[PDB]
């Protein structure tokens, strides 16, 4: 079969820094390759379209360039990022061979360009134990996890129970909300729920963990503030069941 | 974007109903037509494509194309909560895909045995906040945001893809205020008169 991969998935970089997005496709030869950019609440806009007959480019001036060093590798670059370059970048391909085929996108690249890296904050994470009233009325126990005060707005929250990630009974906000709606550079918050049976919650041997991956600064980014360099990291909170 | 338009407001239907997405394209010589689905935070996924006038049916989805009026539509039958997404129309001309700006669709789950209740959870010692959970209400209930900008409320969440358990609706409200109680957390929302409020 054929697939397509792009990386990095999510980038947080300062203005004036270089950009390099990668994209590879497998299972075909001489594919059409595309780079798109998508704004929130809008459809993907074509940046570059390369193929056997040439390069087609967006009619609107871009601060980006494309390269194809190998048949199945497509790269999106910039020597010097602008604040206006923040966005969601998408790579895609289509079959040039007999018959249709492809028209699939990679996983995308979330790019956040920052004017000032001191605005970056990792999340604080807390888990809240189920209500005894819920347990009585329903025989179910809902735990809640709150990830608060982070910036930029992208984190990945997962729940772990006894060393294994769980998906059943999990409901997580699709996107973070702004703690300060009227303020431009507001920090963010995200919530999730894990619902298990009362009987499972009431065993104190059961260990629950809310885990949040945050993407921020990399090792090479400079930092002189007292607080810990807000680097890409995992922040989590945990709880153990209780008999009561 | 004017070559491909999806001029429609946000759609919403109850689970099991039929939904219909519309799209118009400008070039009559366009060769093929596509529908993608896109969830929050993800890249778009291909649903179907079609190059012939008429209907192309695939499972619960039907792509309809009229090359005279230059309209493309996606018909979704027996809608599922997991069909909740942004739908994108795209048109191929010589290999160049042009996309519309998308249309959102929400499919409300059918809650067979509601039990609207507001509970107070307790922090695991390391926060200072208290959290209130409004859960088990049926989908005809809308959770409004709080007037107090010091109280946060997250209306709807998304059930994990690999979840094998049923889905119930819930809203979370939190604040660090001393006068914050679950008894008033959701006062700006219209909740069922039969909502269970346990008394601590």
Author numbering:
A (entry chain E): 1 to 244
B (entry chain D): 1 to 200
Please give the exact wording used by the authors of the publication that reports this structure.
The T-cell receptor (TCR) recognizes peptides bound to major histocompatibility molecules (MHC) and allows T-cells to interrogate the cellular proteome for internal anomalies from the cell surface. Here we explored these issues using phage display to generate a high affinity TCR derived from the MEL5 TCR specific for the heteroclitic version of the HLA-A*0201-restricted primary melanoma antigen recognized by T-cells 1 (MART-126–35) peptide, ELAGIGILTV (A2-ELA). This TCR, α24β17, bound to A2-ELA with an affinity 30,000 times stronger than the natural parent MEL5 TCR, resulting in picomolar levels of binding. Remarkably, although the enhanced affinity was mediated primarily through new TCR-MHC contacts, α24β17 remained acutely sensitive to modifications at every position along the peptide backbone, mimicking the specificity of the wild type TCR.
Additionally, we solved the structure of the unligated α24β17 TCR and unligated A2-ELA1A, A2-ELA4A, and A2-ELA8A molecules. The structure of the unligated α24β17 TCR demonstrated that a large 8.06 Å conformational shift in CDR3β loop was required to accommodate residues toward the C terminus of the peptide. Together with the observation of a favorable entropy change for binding, these observations indicated that, similar to the MEL5-A2-ELA complex (TΔS° ∼ 8.3 kcal/mol), an entropically favorable transition from order to disorder was key for driving the high affinity interaction, probably through the expulsion of ordered solvent during binding rather than a loss of order at the TCR-pMHC interface.
